[PDB]
Design an enzyme around this catalytic site. Structure first.
Site, PDB file in Angstrom:
ATOM      1  N   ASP A   1      18.569  68.391  41.374  1.00 50.34           N
ATOM      2  CA  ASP A   1      18.765  67.261  42.288  1.00 50.34           C
ATOM      3  C   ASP A   1      20.219  66.783  42.319  1.00 50.34           C
ATOM      4  O   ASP A   1      20.519  65.638  41.978  1.00 50.34           O
ATOM      5  CB  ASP A   1      17.775  66.125  41.980  1.00 50.34           C
ATOM      6  CG  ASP A   1      17.372  65.261  43.165  1.00 50.34           C
ATOM      7  OD1 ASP A   1      17.367  65.780  44.313  1.00 50.34           O
ATOM      8  OD2 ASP A   1      17.045  64.066  42.946  1.00 50.34           O
TER       9      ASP A   1
ATOM     10  N   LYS B   1      19.650  62.129  35.075  1.00 51.56           N
ATOM     11  CA  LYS B   1      18.440  61.374  34.714  1.00 51.56           C
ATOM     12  C   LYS B   1      17.361  62.356  34.241  1.00 51.56           C
ATOM     13  O   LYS B   1      17.358  63.517  34.663  1.00 51.56           O
ATOM     14  CB  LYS B   1      17.929  60.464  35.859  1.00 51.56           C
ATOM     15  CG  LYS B   1      17.706  61.150  37.185  1.00 51.56           C
ATOM     16  CD  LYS B   1      17.889  60.165  38.323  1.00 51.56           C
ATOM     17  CE  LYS B   1      17.280  60.681  39.604  1.00 51.56           C
ATOM     18  NZ  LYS B   1      18.146  60.418  40.788  1.00 51.56           N
TER      19      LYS B   1
ATOM     20  N   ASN C   1      15.593  64.809  36.581  1.00 51.52           N
ATOM     21  CA  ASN C   1      16.293  66.010  37.046  1.00 51.52           C
ATOM     22  C   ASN C   1      16.710  66.973  35.930  1.00 51.52           C
ATOM     23  O   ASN C   1      17.544  67.852  36.166  1.00 51.52           O
ATOM     24  CB  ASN C   1      17.527  65.630  37.854  1.00 51.52           C
ATOM     25  CG  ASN C   1      17.266  64.655  38.981  1.00 51.52           C
ATOM     26  OD1 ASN C   1      16.163  64.579  39.569  1.00 51.52           O
ATOM     27  ND2 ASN C   1      18.296  63.896  39.322  1.00 51.52           N
TER      28      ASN C   1
ATOM     29  N   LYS D   1      11.440  66.732  48.944  1.00 51.72           N
ATOM     30  CA  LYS D   1      10.238  67.029  48.138  1.00 51.72           C
ATOM     31  C   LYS D   1      10.285  68.442  47.561  1.00 51.72           C
ATOM     32  O   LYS D   1      10.875  69.327  48.166  1.00 51.72           O
ATOM     33  CB  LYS D   1       8.955  66.882  48.976  1.00 51.72           C
ATOM     34  CG  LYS D   1       8.683  65.474  49.471  1.00 51.72           C
ATOM     35  CD  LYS D   1       7.862  64.648  48.476  1.00 51.72           C
ATOM     36  CE  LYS D   1       7.829  63.178  48.873  1.00 51.72           C
ATOM     37  NZ  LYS D   1       6.970  62.349  47.975  1.00 51.72           N
ATOM     38  N   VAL D   2       9.640  68.668  46.409  1.00 45.68           N
ATOM     39  CA  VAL D   2       9.629  69.982  45.764  1.00 45.68           C
ATOM     40  C   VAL D   2       8.217  70.558  45.655  1.00 45.68           C
ATOM     41  O   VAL D   2       7.363  69.962  45.007  1.00 45.68           O
ATOM     42  CB  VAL D   2      10.304  69.933  44.374  1.00 45.68           C
ATOM     43  CG1 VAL D   2      10.326  71.315  43.730  1.00 45.68           C
ATOM     44  CG2 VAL D   2      11.713  69.363  44.474  1.00 45.68           C
TER      45      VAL D   2
ATOM     46  N   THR E   1      19.523  56.507  41.532  1.00 46.75           N
ATOM     47  CA  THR E   1      18.742  55.633  40.629  1.00 46.75           C
ATOM     48  C   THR E   1      19.641  54.593  39.958  1.00 46.75           C
ATOM     49  O   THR E   1      20.563  54.943  39.215  1.00 46.75           O
ATOM     50  CB  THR E   1      17.955  56.408  39.560  1.00 46.75           C
ATOM     51  OG1 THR E   1      17.013  57.285  40.180  1.00 46.75           O
ATOM     52  CG2 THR E   1      17.217  55.471  38.617  1.00 46.75           C
TER      53      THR E   1
ATOM     54  N   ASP F   1      24.166  62.505  39.499  1.00 43.87           N
ATOM     55  CA  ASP F   1      22.758  62.100  39.490  1.00 43.87           C
ATOM     56  C   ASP F   1      21.988  62.497  38.202  1.00 43.87           C
ATOM     57  O   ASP F   1      20.830  62.916  38.284  1.00 43.87           O
ATOM     58  CB  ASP F   1      22.022  62.594  40.754  1.00 43.87           C
ATOM     59  CG  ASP F   1      20.831  61.711  41.143  1.00 43.87           C
ATOM     60  OD1 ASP F   1      20.787  60.528  40.698  1.00 43.87           O
ATOM     61  OD2 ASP F   1      19.944  62.199  41.889  1.00 43.87           O
TER      62      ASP F   1
HETATM   63  C1  LIG Z   1       6.299  71.807  37.045  1.00 46.50           C
HETATM   64  C2  LIG Z   1       7.629  71.188  37.316  1.00 46.50           C
HETATM   65  N1  LIG Z   1       8.647  72.205  37.130  1.00 46.50           N
HETATM   66  C3  LIG Z   1       9.656  72.424  38.015  1.00 46.50           C
HETATM   67  C4  LIG Z   1      10.210  71.366  38.720  1.00 46.50           C
HETATM   68  C5  LIG Z   1      11.314  71.623  39.549  1.00 46.50           C
HETATM   69  C6  LIG Z   1      11.987  70.591  40.226  1.00 46.50           C
HETATM   70  C7  LIG Z   1      13.137  70.860  40.918  1.00 46.50           C
HETATM   71  C8  LIG Z   1      13.930  69.771  41.534  1.00 46.50           C
HETATM   72  C9  LIG Z   1      14.758  69.819  42.623  1.00 46.50           C
HETATM   73  N2  LIG Z   1      15.275  68.572  42.899  1.00 46.50           N
HETATM   74  C10 LIG Z   1      14.765  67.770  41.990  1.00 46.50           C
HETATM   75  N3  LIG Z   1      13.954  68.406  41.119  1.00 46.50           N
HETATM   76  C11 LIG Z   1      13.284  67.803  39.968  1.00 46.50           C
HETATM   77  N4  LIG Z   1      13.641  72.102  41.031  1.00 46.50           N
HETATM   78  C12 LIG Z   1      13.030  73.121  40.420  1.00 46.50           C
HETATM   79  N5  LIG Z   1      13.629  74.321  40.490  1.00 46.50           N
HETATM   80  C13 LIG Z   1      11.824  72.944  39.640  1.00 46.50           C
HETATM   81  C14 LIG Z   1      11.137  73.924  38.888  1.00 46.50           C
HETATM   82  N6  LIG Z   1      10.105  73.685  38.108  1.00 46.50           N
END
Ligand SMILES: CCNc1cc2cc(-c3cncn3C)nc(N)c2cn1
Length: 250
Positions: free
Chosen positions: A138, A122, A125, A17-18, A144, A120
């Site tokens: 990711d 998509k 990501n 999770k992020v 997927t 990966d």
């Molecule tokens: C407001 C949304 N913005 C955003 C999303 C992020 C998602 C991920 C991530 C890590 N693994 C998958 N994701 C998708 N990493 C980051 N550094 C992110 C920074 N910002």
């Protein structure tokens, strides 16, 4: 050596999770990976090593640990992901989709030039940086199903051509909103991928000749013939593209 205590969880941004972090009036994006899958389902020190090495890919600030969890403190990009942006617009116009795909391609080319397959790719990501160009997250070295290349399905020995297939899946999905091999069951999806069942649109919505060709070269079953960056750079759809300038725009 900073500690995870300094980080204050703000709100989740992704489903590991992020979360959106806080530390010293700065916002980070902290990925949580509990030892439930890290130490009990196998390649965790693979995403942390593909993220540490940089200008096209999301910046990794810190590598932190916990009682069970692991923490990837990366940069926060308010722009969100292309996945969200696409849901908003429904689909992108030819000019806009080519803009993003070329950026993704330069990032892919960067990765491979440094011995790294994404595996990966998509829209989920693909992050829209604060500058505007696409950044990658990711890192998965089954993911997927809708984007996996046939060789990935057939458990074959593969190469970076898997990324160009995934790129092809996104180029189609940017012009349509829907991935080409979309079906209700996962097994059905594999049959479409293997059959190369691309559902080209007809009428006023029917895809350009340069767009259909660009998807076709990327979505080629035979990986020893499928398009690379060389083929892509020289393809007529990416004609009005200054790769020299784009590389500098960063
Ligand atoms: C407001 C949304 N913005 C955003 C999303 C992020 C998602 C991920 C991530 C890590 N693994 C998958 N994701 C998708 N990493 C980051 N550094 C992110 C920074 N910002």
């Amino acid at each position: 050596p900073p500690s995870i205590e300094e980080f204050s969880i703000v709100k989740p941004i992704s489903r590991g999770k992020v979360y959106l972090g806080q530390k010293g009036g700065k916002l980070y994006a902290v990925k949580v990976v509990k030892k439930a899958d890290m130490i009990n389902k196998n390649q965790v020190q693979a995403e942390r090593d593909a993220l540490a090495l940089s200008p096209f890919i999301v910046h990794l600030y810190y590598s932190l640990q916990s009682a069970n969890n692991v923490y990837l403190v990366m940069e926060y990009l308010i722009g969100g992901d292309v996945k969200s942006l696409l849901h908003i617009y429904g689909y992108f116009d030819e000019e806009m989709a080519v803009k993003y795909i070329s950026e993704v391609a330069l990032a892919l080319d960067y990765l491979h030039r440094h011995g790294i397959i994404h595996r990966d790719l998509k829209p989920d990501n693909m992050l829209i940086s604060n500058e505007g160009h696409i950044k990658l997250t990711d890192f998965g070295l089954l993911g997927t199903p809708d984007y996996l290349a046939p060789e990935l399905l057939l458990g074959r020995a593969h190469g970076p051509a898997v990324d160009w297939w995934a790129l092809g899946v996104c180029l189609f999905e940017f012009l349509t909103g829907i991935p080409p091999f979309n079906d209700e069951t996962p097994q059905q999806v594999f049959q479409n991928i293997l059959k190369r069942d691309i559902p080209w649109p007809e009428g006023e919505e029917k895809l350009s000749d340069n767009a259909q060709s660009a998807v076709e070269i990327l979505l080629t079953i035979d990986d020893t013939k499928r398009a690379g960056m060389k083929e892509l750079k020289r393809h007529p759809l990416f004609s009005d593209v200054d790769w020299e300038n784009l590389q500098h725009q960063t």
